[PDB]
Every structure is written in structure tokens, then in C-alpha cells.
mmCIF file of C-alpha atoms and ligand atoms in Angstrom:
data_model
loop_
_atom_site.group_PDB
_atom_site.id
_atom_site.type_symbol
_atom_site.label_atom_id
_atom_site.label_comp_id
_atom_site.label_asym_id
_atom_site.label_seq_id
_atom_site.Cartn_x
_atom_site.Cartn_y
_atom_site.Cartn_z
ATOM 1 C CA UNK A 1185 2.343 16.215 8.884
ATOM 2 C CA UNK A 1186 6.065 14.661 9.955
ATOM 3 C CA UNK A 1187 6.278 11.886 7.232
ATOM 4 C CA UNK A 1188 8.418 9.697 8.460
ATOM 5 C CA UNK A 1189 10.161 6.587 7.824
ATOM 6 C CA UNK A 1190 8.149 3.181 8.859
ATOM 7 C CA UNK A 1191 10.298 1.121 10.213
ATOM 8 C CA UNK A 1192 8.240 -2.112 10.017
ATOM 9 C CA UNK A 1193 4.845 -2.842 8.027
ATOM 10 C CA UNK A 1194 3.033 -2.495 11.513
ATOM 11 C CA UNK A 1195 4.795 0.556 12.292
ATOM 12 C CA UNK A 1196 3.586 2.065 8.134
ATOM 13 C CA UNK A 1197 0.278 0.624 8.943
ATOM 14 C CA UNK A 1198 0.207 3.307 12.081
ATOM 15 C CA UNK A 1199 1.190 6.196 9.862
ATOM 16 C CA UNK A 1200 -0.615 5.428 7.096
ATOM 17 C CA UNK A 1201 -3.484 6.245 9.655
ATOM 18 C CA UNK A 1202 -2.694 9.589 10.610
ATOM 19 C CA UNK A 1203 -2.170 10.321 7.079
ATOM 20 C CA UNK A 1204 -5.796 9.019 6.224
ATOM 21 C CA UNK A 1205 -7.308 10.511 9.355
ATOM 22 C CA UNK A 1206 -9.126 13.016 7.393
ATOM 23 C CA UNK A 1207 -11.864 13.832 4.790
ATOM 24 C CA UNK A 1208 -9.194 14.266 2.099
ATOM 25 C CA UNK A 1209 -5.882 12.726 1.148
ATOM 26 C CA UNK A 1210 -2.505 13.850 0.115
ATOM 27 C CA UNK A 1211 -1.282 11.470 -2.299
ATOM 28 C CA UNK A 1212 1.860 12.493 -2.914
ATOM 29 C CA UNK A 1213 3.261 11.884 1.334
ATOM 30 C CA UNK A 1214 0.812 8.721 0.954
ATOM 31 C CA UNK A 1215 3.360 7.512 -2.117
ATOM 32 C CA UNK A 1216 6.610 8.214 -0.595
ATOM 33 C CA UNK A 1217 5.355 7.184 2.448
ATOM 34 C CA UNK A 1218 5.160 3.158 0.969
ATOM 35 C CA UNK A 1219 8.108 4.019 -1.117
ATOM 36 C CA UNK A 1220 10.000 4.273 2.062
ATOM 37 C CA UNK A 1221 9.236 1.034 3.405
ATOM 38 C CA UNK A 1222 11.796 -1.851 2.847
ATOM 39 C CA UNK A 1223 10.067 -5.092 2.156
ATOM 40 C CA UNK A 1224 10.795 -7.315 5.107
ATOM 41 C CA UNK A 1225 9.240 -10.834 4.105
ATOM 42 C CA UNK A 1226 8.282 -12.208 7.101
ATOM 43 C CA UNK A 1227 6.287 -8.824 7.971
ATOM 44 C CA UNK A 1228 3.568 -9.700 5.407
ATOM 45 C CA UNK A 1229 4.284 -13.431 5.237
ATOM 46 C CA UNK A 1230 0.948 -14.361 6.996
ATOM 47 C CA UNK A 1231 -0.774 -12.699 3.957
ATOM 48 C CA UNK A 1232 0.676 -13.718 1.525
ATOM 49 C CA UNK A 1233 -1.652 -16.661 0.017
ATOM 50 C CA UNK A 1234 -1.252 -17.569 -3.733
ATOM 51 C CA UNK A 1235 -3.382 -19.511 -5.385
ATOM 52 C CA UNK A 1236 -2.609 -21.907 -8.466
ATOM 53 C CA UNK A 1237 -4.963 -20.467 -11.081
ATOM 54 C CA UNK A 1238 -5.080 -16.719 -10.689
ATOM 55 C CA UNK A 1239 -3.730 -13.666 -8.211
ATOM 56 C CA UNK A 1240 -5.089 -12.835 -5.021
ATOM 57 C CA UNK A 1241 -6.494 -10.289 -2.776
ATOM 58 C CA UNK A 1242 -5.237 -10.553 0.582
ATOM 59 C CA UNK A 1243 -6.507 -8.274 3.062
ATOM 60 C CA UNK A 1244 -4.447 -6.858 6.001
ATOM 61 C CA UNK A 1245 -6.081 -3.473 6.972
ATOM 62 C CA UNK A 1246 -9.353 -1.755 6.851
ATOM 63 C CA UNK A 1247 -7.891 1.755 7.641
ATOM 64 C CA UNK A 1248 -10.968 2.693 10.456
ATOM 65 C CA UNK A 1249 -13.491 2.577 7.114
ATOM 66 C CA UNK A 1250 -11.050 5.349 5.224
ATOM 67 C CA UNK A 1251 -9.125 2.719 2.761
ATOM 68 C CA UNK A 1252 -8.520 -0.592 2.257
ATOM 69 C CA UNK A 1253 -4.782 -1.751 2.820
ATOM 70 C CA UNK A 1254 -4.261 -5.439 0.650
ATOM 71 C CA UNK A 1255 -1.505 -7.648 -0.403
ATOM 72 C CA UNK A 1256 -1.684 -9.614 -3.930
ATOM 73 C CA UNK A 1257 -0.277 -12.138 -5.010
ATOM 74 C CA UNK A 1258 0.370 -12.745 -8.799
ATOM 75 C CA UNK A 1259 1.878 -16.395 -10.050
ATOM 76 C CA UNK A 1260 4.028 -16.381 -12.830
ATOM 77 C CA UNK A 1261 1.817 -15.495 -16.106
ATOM 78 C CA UNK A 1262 -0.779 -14.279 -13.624
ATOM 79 C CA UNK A 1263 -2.253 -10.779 -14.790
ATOM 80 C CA UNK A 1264 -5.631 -8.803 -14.023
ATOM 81 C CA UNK A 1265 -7.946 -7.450 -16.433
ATOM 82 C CA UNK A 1266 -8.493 -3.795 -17.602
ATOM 83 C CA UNK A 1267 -9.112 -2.726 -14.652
ATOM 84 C CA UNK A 1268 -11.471 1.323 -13.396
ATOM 85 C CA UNK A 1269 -10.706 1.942 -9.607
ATOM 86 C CA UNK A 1270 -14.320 3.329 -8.846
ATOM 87 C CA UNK A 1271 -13.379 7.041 -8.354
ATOM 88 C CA UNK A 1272 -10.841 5.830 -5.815
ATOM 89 C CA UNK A 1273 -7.359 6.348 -5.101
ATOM 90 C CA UNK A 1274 -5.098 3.758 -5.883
ATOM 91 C CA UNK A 1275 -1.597 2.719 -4.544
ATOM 92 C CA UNK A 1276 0.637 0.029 -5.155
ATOM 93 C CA UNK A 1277 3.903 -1.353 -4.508
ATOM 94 C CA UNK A 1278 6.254 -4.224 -5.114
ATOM 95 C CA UNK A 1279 6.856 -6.401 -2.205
ATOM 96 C CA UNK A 1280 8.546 -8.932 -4.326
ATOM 97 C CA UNK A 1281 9.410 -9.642 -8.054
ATOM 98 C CA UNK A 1282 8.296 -7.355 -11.026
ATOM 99 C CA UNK A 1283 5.167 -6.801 -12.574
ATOM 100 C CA UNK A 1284 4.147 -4.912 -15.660
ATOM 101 C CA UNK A 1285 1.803 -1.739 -15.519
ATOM 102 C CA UNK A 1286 -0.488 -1.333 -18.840
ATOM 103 C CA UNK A 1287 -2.017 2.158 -19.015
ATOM 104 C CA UNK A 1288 -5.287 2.294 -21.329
ATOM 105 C CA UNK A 1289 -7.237 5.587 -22.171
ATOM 106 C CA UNK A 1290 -10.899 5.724 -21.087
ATOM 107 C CA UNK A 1291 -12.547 3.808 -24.376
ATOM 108 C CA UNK A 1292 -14.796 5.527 -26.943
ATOM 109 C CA UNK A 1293 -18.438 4.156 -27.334
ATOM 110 C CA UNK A 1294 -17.732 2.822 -30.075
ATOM 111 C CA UNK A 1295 -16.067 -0.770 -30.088
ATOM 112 C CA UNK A 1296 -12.754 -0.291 -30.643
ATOM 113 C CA UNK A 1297 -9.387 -2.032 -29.569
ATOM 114 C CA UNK A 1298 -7.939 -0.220 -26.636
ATOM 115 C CA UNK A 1299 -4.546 0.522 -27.547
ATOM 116 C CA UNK A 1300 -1.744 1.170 -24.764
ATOM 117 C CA UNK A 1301 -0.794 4.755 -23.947
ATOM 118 C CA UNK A 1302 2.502 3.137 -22.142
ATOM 119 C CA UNK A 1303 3.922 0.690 -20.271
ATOM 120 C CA UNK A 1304 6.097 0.537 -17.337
ATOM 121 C CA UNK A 1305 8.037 -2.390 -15.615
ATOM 122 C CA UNK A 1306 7.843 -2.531 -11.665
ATOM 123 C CA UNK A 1307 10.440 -2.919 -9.226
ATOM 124 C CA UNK A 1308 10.743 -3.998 -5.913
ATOM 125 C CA UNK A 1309 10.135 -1.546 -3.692
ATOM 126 C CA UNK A 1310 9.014 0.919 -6.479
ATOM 127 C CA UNK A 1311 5.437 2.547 -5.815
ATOM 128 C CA UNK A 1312 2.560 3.426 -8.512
ATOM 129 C CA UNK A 1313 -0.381 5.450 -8.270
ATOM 130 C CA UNK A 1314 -3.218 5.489 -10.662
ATOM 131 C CA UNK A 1315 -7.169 6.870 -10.274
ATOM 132 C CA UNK A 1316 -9.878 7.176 -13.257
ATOM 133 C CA UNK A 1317 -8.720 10.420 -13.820
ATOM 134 C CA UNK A 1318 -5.593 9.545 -15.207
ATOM 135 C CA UNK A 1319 -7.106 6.512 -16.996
ATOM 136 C CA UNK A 1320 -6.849 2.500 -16.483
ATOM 137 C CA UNK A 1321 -4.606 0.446 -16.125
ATOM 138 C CA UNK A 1322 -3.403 -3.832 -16.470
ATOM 139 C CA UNK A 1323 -0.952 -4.986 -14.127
ATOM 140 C CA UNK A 1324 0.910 -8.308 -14.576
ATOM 141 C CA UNK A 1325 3.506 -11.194 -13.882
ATOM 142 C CA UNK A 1326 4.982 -11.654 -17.134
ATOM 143 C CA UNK A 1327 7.953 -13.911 -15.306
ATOM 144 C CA UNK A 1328 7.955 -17.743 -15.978
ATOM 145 C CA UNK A 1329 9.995 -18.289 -12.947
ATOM 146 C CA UNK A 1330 9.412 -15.804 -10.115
ATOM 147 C CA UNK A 1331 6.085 -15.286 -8.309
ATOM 148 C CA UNK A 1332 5.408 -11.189 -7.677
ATOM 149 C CA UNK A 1333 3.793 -9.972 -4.382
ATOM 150 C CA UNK A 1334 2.376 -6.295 -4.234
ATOM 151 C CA UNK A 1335 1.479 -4.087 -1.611
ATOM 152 C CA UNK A 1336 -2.372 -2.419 -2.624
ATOM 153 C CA UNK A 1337 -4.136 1.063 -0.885
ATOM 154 C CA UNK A 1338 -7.364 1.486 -1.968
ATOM 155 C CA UNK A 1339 -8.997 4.850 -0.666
ATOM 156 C CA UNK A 1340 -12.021 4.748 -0.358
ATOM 157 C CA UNK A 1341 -12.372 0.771 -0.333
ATOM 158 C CA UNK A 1342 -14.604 -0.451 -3.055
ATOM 159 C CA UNK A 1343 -15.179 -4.237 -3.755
ATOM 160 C CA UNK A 1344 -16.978 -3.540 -7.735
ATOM 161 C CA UNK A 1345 -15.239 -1.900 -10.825
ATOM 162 C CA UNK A 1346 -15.295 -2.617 -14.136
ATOM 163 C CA UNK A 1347 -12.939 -4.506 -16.387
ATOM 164 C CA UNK A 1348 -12.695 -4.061 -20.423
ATOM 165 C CA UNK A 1349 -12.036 -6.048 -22.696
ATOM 166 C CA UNK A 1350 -9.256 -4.929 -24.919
ATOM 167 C CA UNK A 1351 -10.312 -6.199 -27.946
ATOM 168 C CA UNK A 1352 -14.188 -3.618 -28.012
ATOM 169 C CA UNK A 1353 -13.701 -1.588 -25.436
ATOM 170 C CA UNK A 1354 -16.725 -3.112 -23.950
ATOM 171 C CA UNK A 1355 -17.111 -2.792 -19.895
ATOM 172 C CA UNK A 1356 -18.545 -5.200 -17.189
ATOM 173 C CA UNK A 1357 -19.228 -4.939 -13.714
ATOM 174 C CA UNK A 1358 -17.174 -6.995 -11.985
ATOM 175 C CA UNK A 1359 -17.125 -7.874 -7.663
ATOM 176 C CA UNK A 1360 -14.082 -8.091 -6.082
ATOM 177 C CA UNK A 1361 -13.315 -10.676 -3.996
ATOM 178 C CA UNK A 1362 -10.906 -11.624 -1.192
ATOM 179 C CA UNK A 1363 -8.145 -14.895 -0.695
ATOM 180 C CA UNK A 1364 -7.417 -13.868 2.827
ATOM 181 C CA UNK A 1365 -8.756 -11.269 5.519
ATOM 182 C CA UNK A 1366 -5.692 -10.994 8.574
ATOM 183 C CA UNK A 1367 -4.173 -14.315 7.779
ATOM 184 C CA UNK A 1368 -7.334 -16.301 7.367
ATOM 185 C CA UNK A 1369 -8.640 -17.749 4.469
ATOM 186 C CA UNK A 1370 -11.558 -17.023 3.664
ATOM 187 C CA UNK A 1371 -14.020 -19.147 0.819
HETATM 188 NA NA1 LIG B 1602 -8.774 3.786 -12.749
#
């Protein structure tokens, strides 16, 4: 249980294995564990595949079945939906640029806007954390000018969740999809 620092994204992709070796996971060494990797550009260069109309999934490890390790890519403007994580854990952090984290309280049944618990702003190199426990959450590129590129642990992987609309409260299933699986596009 020696956390220590990765060096490169290769070299966090190794720990981030031990750490996920087993039937449960400790979130908080998982966090700091990202946190303490330096985005270095050309690492995750390869994965990084934007497309004009919308962000992308990008997918650069499938953790031996225990988690899915992604990198998105968010033009300017570019934002996700209301977004459940499908009793998962969920990890992000800022490669490059800033994006804005929306938390939402689970909706009543009855249709009602969803109004924001809080909001945070992003950093490079900062880390968040969020599961349905603790509620759901937007994230977006509110910049005009600068492209943002996050790091994503998903644990278990799912590729369905639900998004909801802000306006009712109203939920839809919704398949994920991916830009990119180790460097190569994929339609
Ligand atoms: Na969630």
C-alpha cells in the first residue's frame, strides 16, 4: 500500500493496477494518486482526439476488467449532460484547460427544475471524485478560446447511465460511446 509518485502516465497506469487489484477500492490513495501526476502532453497525446461537434471518450486502459481508464476531450462550449455514474466510482482530472463541475441532487418524481447544489471550477492538474451517492453531476468547457482535456477512471466500467434533463427532472438511458480505443479511431 506504498502510494507513490508516477512518474510518467505509463508508470500511473502500473500503480493504478495494484491499487485496483482487489474486490474493493480505496478512493481516497486512488485520488491523490492522479493528483500526483504532472500532465506531460506528449504522454497522452496519441489519445487525445477532439472532435468538432461535441467531447470525446478516448480510451487508454481497461484496468484487467476492474475500471476503465479514458481521456476526454471537451472543445470550447463543449459540455455533457446531467450525467448518473451507474453505481460506479468516478475519477477525473484536468490534463489541460478548465472545466466547470455542476453538482445536481438526485430529482424528485415529480417534474421539477433541477437546481444546482454548487459549482466548482477545475484546474489543471486538480482531481474530482463523484459516485450516485453523493449525487450528479455536469461537467463543462465554458472557455471560447482554450480546448480542455481530462483524465477519466471509471470503476467498475459501465458504457449506459442516464442523463436528465434540467428543466423536469426527467431521466433517459443513454449508451456511451467511444472516439478512440489505444490511439485508434474507432466509428
Ligand atoms: Na453519479
Amino acid at each position: 500500500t506504498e502510494l507513490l509518485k508516477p512518474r510518467t502516465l505509463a508508470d500511473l497506469i502500473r500503480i493504478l493496477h495494484e491499487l485496483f487489484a482487489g474486490d474493493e477500492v480505496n478512493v481516497e490513495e486512488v485520488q491523490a494518486v492522479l493528483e500526483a501526476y504532472e500532465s506531460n502532453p506528449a504522454e497522452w497525446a496519441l489519445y487525445a482526439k477532439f472532435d468538432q461537434y461535441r467531447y470525446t471518450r478516448n480510451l487508454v486502459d481497461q484496468g484487467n476488467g476492474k475500471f476503465n481508464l479514458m481521456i476526454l476531450c471537451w472543445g470550447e462550449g463543449h459540455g455533457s449532460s446531467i450525467h448518473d455514474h451507474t453505481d460506479s466510482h468516478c475519477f477525473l482530472k484536468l490534463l489541460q484547460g478548465n472545466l466547470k463541475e455542476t453538482l445536481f441532487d438526485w430529482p424528485d418524481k415529480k417534474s421539477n427544475e433541477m437546481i444546482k447544489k454548487s459549482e466548482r471550477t477545475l484546474r489543471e492538474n486538480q482531481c474530482a471524485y463523484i459516485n450516485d451517492s453523493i449525487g450528479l453531476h455536469r461537467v463543462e468547457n465554458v472557455s471560447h478560446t482554450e480546448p480542455a482535456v481530462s483524465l477519466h477512471l471509471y470503476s467498475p466500467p459501465f458504457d449506459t447511465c442516464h442523463a436528465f434533463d434540467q428543466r423536469t427532472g426527467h431521466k433517459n438511458k443513454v449508451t456511451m460511446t467511444f472516439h478512440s480505443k489505444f490511439g485508434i479511431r474507432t466509428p
